[PDB]
Design a binder for these strands. Sequence first.
RNA 1: CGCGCCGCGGCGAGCCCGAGGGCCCCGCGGCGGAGCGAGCGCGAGACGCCCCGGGCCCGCCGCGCCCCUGCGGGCGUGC
RNA 2: GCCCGCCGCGGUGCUGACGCGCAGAUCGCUCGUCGGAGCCGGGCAUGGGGGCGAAAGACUCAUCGAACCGCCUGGUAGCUGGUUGCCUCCGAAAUGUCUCCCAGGACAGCCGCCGCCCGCAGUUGCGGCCCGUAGAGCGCUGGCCGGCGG
RNA 3: GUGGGCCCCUCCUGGUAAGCAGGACGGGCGAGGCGGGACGAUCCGGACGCCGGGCCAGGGUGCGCCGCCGGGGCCGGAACGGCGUCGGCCG
RNA 4: CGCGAGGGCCGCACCCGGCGCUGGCGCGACGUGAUUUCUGCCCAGUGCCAGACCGUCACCGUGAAGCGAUCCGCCGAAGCCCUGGUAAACGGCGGGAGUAAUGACUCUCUUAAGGUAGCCAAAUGCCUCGUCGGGCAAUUUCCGACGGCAUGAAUGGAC
RNA 5: AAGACCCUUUUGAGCUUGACUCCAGCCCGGGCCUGUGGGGCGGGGCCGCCCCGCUCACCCGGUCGCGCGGGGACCCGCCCGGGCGGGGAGUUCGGCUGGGGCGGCGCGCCUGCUACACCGGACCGCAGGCGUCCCACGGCGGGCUCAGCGAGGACCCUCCCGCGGAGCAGAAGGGCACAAGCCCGCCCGACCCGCGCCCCCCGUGCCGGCGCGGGCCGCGAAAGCGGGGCCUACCGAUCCUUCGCCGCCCCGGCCGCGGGCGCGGAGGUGGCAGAAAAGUUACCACAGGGAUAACUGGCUUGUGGCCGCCGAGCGCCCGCAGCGACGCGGCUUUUUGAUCCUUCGAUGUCGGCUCUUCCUACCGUCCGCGCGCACCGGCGCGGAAGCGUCGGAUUGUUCACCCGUUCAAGGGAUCGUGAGCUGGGUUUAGA
RNA 6: AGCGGCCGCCACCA
Lengths: 49, 51, 56, 94
Amino acid sequence: VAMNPVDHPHGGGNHQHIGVSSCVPRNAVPGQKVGLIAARRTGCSGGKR
Amino acid sequence: MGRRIRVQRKGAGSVFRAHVARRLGAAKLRANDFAERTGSVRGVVKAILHD
Amino acid sequence: AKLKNHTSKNQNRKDHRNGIKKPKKSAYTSHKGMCPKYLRNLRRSRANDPRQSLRP
Amino acid sequence: VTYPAERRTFCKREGKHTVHKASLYKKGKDSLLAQGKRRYDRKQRGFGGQTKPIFRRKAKTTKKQVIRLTCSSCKCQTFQVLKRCHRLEISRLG
RNA sequence: CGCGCCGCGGCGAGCCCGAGGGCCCCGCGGCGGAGCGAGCGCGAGACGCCCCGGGCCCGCCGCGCCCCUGCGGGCGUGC
RNA sequence: GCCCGCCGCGGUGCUGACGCGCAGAUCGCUCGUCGGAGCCGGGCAUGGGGGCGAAAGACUCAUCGAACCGCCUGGUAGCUGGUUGCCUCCGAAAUGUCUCCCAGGACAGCCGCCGCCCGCAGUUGCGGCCCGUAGAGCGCUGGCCGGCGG
RNA sequence: GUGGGCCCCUCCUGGUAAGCAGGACGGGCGAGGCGGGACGAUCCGGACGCCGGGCCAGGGUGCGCCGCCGGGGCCGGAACGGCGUCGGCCG
RNA sequence: CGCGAGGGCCGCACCCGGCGCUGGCGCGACGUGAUUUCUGCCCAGUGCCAGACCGUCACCGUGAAGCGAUCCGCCGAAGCCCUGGUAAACGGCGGGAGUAAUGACUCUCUUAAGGUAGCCAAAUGCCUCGUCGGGCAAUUUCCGACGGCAUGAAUGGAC
RNA sequence: AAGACCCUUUUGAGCUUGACUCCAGCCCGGGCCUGUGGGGCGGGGCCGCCCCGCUCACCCGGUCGCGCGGGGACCCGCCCGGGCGGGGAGUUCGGCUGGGGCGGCGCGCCUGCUACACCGGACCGCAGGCGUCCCACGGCGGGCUCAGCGAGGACCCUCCCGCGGAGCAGAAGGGCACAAGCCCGCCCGACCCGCGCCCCCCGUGCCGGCGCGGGCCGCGAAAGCGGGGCCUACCGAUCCUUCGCCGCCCCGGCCGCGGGCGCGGAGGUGGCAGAAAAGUUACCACAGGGAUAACUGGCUUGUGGCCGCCGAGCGCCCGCAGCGACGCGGCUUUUUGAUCCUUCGAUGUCGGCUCUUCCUACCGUCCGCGCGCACCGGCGCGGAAGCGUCGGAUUGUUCACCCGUUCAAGGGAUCGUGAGCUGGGUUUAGA
RNA sequence: AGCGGCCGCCACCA
Ligand SMILES: [K+]
Ligand SMILES: [K+]
Ligand SMILES: [K+]
Ligand SMILES: [K+]
Ligand SMILES: [K+]
Ligand SMILES: [K+]
Ligand SMILES: [K+]
Ligand SMILES: [K+]
Ligand SMILES: [K+]
Ligand SMILES: [K+]
Ligand SMILES: [K+]
Ligand SMILES: [K+]
Ligand SMILES: [K+]
Ligand SMILES: [K+]
Ligand SMILES: [K+]
Ligand SMILES: [K+]
Ligand SMILES: [K+]
Ligand SMILES: [K+]
Ligand SMILES: [K+]
Ligand SMILES: [K+]
Ligand SMILES: [K+]
Ligand SMILES: [K+]
Ligand SMILES: [K+]
Ligand SMILES: [K+]
Ligand SMILES: [K+]
Ligand SMILES: [K+]
Ligand SMILES: [K+]
Ligand SMILES: [K+]
Ligand SMILES: [K+]
Ligand SMILES: [K+]
Ligand SMILES: [K+]
Ligand SMILES: [K+]
Ligand SMILES: [K+]
Ligand SMILES: [K+]
Ligand SMILES: [K+]
Ligand SMILES: [K+]
Ligand SMILES: [K+]
Ligand SMILES: [K+]
Ligand SMILES: [K+]
Ligand SMILES: [K+]
Ligand SMILES: [K+]
Ligand SMILES: [K+]
Ligand SMILES: [K+]
Ligand SMILES: [K+]
Ligand SMILES: [K+]
Ligand SMILES: [K+]
Ligand SMILES: [K+]
Ligand SMILES: [K+]
Ligand SMILES: [K+]
Ligand SMILES: [K+]
Ligand SMILES: [K+]
Ligand SMILES: [K+]
Ligand SMILES: [K+]
Ligand SMILES: [K+]
Ligand SMILES: [K+]
Ligand SMILES: [K+]
Ligand SMILES: [K+]
Ligand SMILES: [K+]
Ligand SMILES: [K+]
Ligand SMILES: [K+]
Ligand SMILES: [K+]
Ligand SMILES: [K+]
Ligand SMILES: [K+]
Ligand SMILES: [K+]
Ligand SMILES: [K+]
Ligand SMILES: [K+]
Ligand SMILES: [K+]
Ligand SMILES: [K+]
Ligand SMILES: [K+]
Ligand SMILES: [K+]
Ligand SMILES: [K+]
Ligand SMILES: [K+]
Ligand SMILES: [K+]
Ligand SMILES: [K+]
Ligand SMILES: [Mg+2]
Ligand SMILES: [Mg+2]
Ligand SMILES: [Mg+2]
Ligand SMILES: [Mg+2]
Ligand SMILES: [Mg+2]
Ligand SMILES: [Mg+2]
Ligand SMILES: [Mg+2]
Ligand SMILES: [Mg+2]
Ligand SMILES: [Mg+2]
Ligand SMILES: [Mg+2]
Ligand SMILES: [Mg+2]
Ligand SMILES: [Mg+2]
Ligand SMILES: [Mg+2]
Ligand SMILES: [Mg+2]
Ligand SMILES: [Mg+2]
Ligand SMILES: [Mg+2]
Ligand SMILES: [Mg+2]
Ligand SMILES: [Mg+2]
Ligand SMILES: [Mg+2]
Ligand SMILES: [Mg+2]
Ligand SMILES: [Mg+2]
Ligand SMILES: [Mg+2]
Ligand SMILES: [Mg+2]
Ligand SMILES: [Mg+2]
Ligand SMILES: [Mg+2]
Ligand SMILES: [Mg+2]
Ligand SMILES: [Mg+2]
Ligand SMILES: [Mg+2]
């Protein structure tokens, strides 16, 4: 997010922000597969095992 | 519509290759052979070193 | 951005400059649009008139 | 909107007025061996995408329905085009 | 280089230094001569200094009537 | 990856000098840092829609929101500039219709030239038909002050 | 070739209006020399080969600056004020 | 957040390569940004994921017809559809009327949920030089308070 | 320095994405590569699936081939098929317009008015309408007369007069009475084949209408009338597709399928004489444009500002000391608009500081008059531009607001003044 | 326009 849009798909904007969801699918192509790749779930919650 | 991103540039190598100078070598078990495969073989620890 | 839309300022003079023409002398007698039954009868009468006919 | 089930009008095959039965005309399905379709398929082979225009900017909310009139005595077909309208039905009396 | 129109030269129901072969000699096409019809195909005389119009003839589309070799021939009517 | 401070490395303010310069980025005073993610030299590696980037679209030999060199290439322009002697005879348009048309065109008009052929008029008078404007008016469609008599 | 026009006189439309914008018959500048309107593309006359003489349109005739005398009177801009001066109408 | 090597992410025209002389205290992809004290509600939308084969959805294959070209049926992988999970994924987090000068109370329309703890005319407040206190002879600046055109919780909140 | 702002050009480029049209890559299925055996399930009367041994193809390890393994007919590779796919590629992103944009749609048609009595005549002029609706709401014949007013009749009926004051689908204008309206009867001219004219107009097309020659019909005793619904609006090329008549061709022949062709309708282009099409640029552009905005100047003066006329009232009385409502007439260019004449191969664009000169619509001082002028102090008018109109707190501020003093008018000069300065504001590139 | 039951999924030269 600190870059320009030419350098990265998170780049640009008048505020630093990603813009879309950062969960990307498993079959995304090289150049697209940034952020969280094929996440079953996200966030920080307790109670796993 | 862009340039190649940082993760795309690391695969070619160049400045992204491992710094292997002054490494002691690859760490491995002893190769299985006749004598170990049928009995036991003896070694002595000569040094303990930082890699 | 905007230009003029319309005038007829010089047009009557342009219309007059070569004179006002008249249509040809034979358009007053064109058969076009007359009754075909009348035109048929005309052709028959002249065709059978020995003083008017042009049959060989 | 309402059209008679049956009508008496001219027939060419016999050359006189007879009784005809009404029905609705509908465009049949496209053949694969018509010459323009053959030309289109051959032009669309290969790389390069769409080779002909695709019409988008659509205005009319109505087509002109046409009535098939089938002659009773001899089975000669005739067609009548109607003015544009939104609903149409033929009467049911044979 | 191609297309249209105009002028002039030669010859004229004809015209023509293709290429080629022996500033001279010989030299095919082609275009013009008949059109119309999608096509099967059929196929022009009757008049006129010139021009314009009228009339009639040929083809395409239609329709009376007669016949021989026949969905073929003849003769007519109409836009 | 402590503090003052020299060389070094950097480059804050004077919005100082200079700004036809000493100089296609320099000079003076002031200023940041100075044992560390510190500074310097040589060799080597990464090549153009590619590299490299503690990220400014920065840097890649005074060239970078895509280097430089030769060719394709005398690239296309309804757009701006220019377009070289004399006399004589004629002489416009800036309008209608259509156009991804509105700084451009095609057809028509207006003009030139070349012709060819054998009554007429941008006028008055006389005769016949047509028009609904100025004025006038409140019958028609609408609007509007009041006074009598039942 | 042209398909950006503009102005005047009369007649209009929108606008508080405009040297504003949009239309109409006729004329002009454009593409019209010369004189006059001090000065101006379009107003008033007159529209053009090179000269000599004459007549004169429009405007004018104290000096600059070509050209005059005689006669009869008087002595940018609104509503609204004036016993300034000269002339009238009604009582 | 992904991955136990027959793997994962990346290079690369092809052959062949980097991480890797590596092995989960590792490697790779992302966001926030020392400490202290905290980090509320929403899975309706978009995104991601796994569990079942309902509908749809290729070629191949196969049946019936046909002189044949071919026409019509059947069959049915992944995907979508369906069933669930997930916000330190992207993001979102309220109106009218009364009621002891206010409004603890109430009735009502309504959302996926209706902004919690905090903070503020703030480098975020239009109105606006907001109102009150401090300071000055005098202050559109400044500080302290009060409460939102359009404050607010790893878009990290407060200190 | 051929404006970098702004606009136009059928001139670009960087970036984005739910623009349009695609490509690598990856996922998935069958087939070939590809052996040698054993089994289960189902269907149709041989076919389709599924499973699991072995090793010999093919593939992976260890070893200096020093006394060894693991997978396996599956994987890979190749052919064809389907899905994901701004990671990447190419291209597009209407027009008119008192600048552009937001808005609107005189962009294809219709009525009345503008429009100045033949025809024609402009505007993002005025008041409006159209993309439909009806086998009857149509054709013909016959009969009838509508809206109503007045007068009558137990708690709809009758007469009389009745120029249309009703009705005729929907805007407006026009038209119509033994009808063009209403009711009844029968019908389908809301048909077929072939021509011409009118409107618009370049005398091209398209919508719409009108006049004919020949078939076949409807109603009517008959003369007649009829190609919809009284008239003026209600709609669509080439190429392609589809359907219907009668035929012709498939070029070495013949036959059957199939294909093509001549005529006519339908599927549609409303941006309506008819491309297949989304954004952003504060990183930037190119050719041009004063044909066109942002700043001076010019015309105008609504708005701002200033000055007159009248005289309902106020002023204890008393219209005019001082005031002055309802109205009416002017001036100025120090406000802001309106417009687009000059300037886009460039006229440095806010304020302050510094310095000079000008105006008078005069605030203090000077000379006169007036008062609801006793004095003091105020107020009103005429002449008058010589001198004076200041120091500070907050704000870039012009402005404003307060404190203080000898108590403190208003303006102009390219909104005076950047090769005089300054650079706080506005006004590129970072955040 | 195509299958299935207002809905899904699929398709597109005047
Ligand atoms: K972003
Ligand atoms: K891009
Ligand atoms: K790229
Ligand atoms: K790239
Ligand atoms: K890329
Ligand atoms: K790169
Ligand atoms: K065809
Ligand atoms: K293609
Ligand atoms: K010759
Ligand atoms: K023919
Ligand atoms: K130093
Ligand atoms: K600096
Ligand atoms: K100095
Ligand atoms: K220096
Ligand atoms: K130190
Ligand atoms: K590299
Ligand atoms: K390199
Ligand atoms: K490049
Ligand atoms: K290059
Ligand atoms: K070169
Ligand atoms: K080359
Ligand atoms: K080039
Ligand atoms: K061009
Ligand atoms: K150009
Ligand atoms: K030039
Ligand atoms: K058009
Ligand atoms: K265009
Ligand atoms: K034009
Ligand atoms: K143009
Ligand atoms: K031309
Ligand atoms: K009246
Ligand atoms: K106005
Ligand atoms: K002239
Ligand atoms: K002239
Ligand atoms: K007088
Ligand atoms: K996050
Ligand atoms: K971190
Ligand atoms: K603590
Ligand atoms: K914290
Ligand atoms: K949700
Ligand atoms: K859910
Ligand atoms: K969800
Ligand atoms: K709160
Ligand atoms: K504060
Ligand atoms: K928020
Ligand atoms: K220029
Ligand atoms: K420019
Ligand atoms: K420019
Ligand atoms: K502009
Ligand atoms: K520009
Ligand atoms: K251009
Ligand atoms: K362009
Ligand atoms: K660019
Ligand atoms: K672009
Ligand atoms: K660029
Ligand atoms: K893509
Ligand atoms: K583009
Ligand atoms: K014409
Ligand atoms: K019409
Ligand atoms: K007829
Ligand atoms: K067509
Ligand atoms: K075409
Ligand atoms: K057809
Ligand atoms: K230029
Ligand atoms: K221009
Ligand atoms: K110009
Ligand atoms: K001009
Ligand atoms: K004025
Ligand atoms: K201008
Ligand atoms: K101007
Ligand atoms: K300029
Ligand atoms: K200047
Ligand atoms: K100049
Ligand atoms: K004075
Ligand atoms: Mg940045
Ligand atoms: Mg991108
Ligand atoms: Mg003429
Ligand atoms: Mg029949
Ligand atoms: Mg230190
Ligand atoms: Mg230090
Ligand atoms: Mg050239
Ligand atoms: Mg060039
Ligand atoms: Mg002449
Ligand atoms: Mg013009
Ligand atoms: Mg078009
Ligand atoms: Mg003008
Ligand atoms: Mg003069
Ligand atoms: Mg003299
Ligand atoms: Mg951060
Ligand atoms: Mg925030
Ligand atoms: Mg330039
Ligand atoms: Mg254009
Ligand atoms: Mg471009
Ligand atoms: Mg435009
Ligand atoms: Mg009619
Ligand atoms: Mg900036
Ligand atoms: Mg101008
Ligand atoms: Mg005024
Ligand atoms: Mg202009
Ligand atoms: Mg200059
Ligand atoms: Mg200057
Ligand atoms: Mg300067």
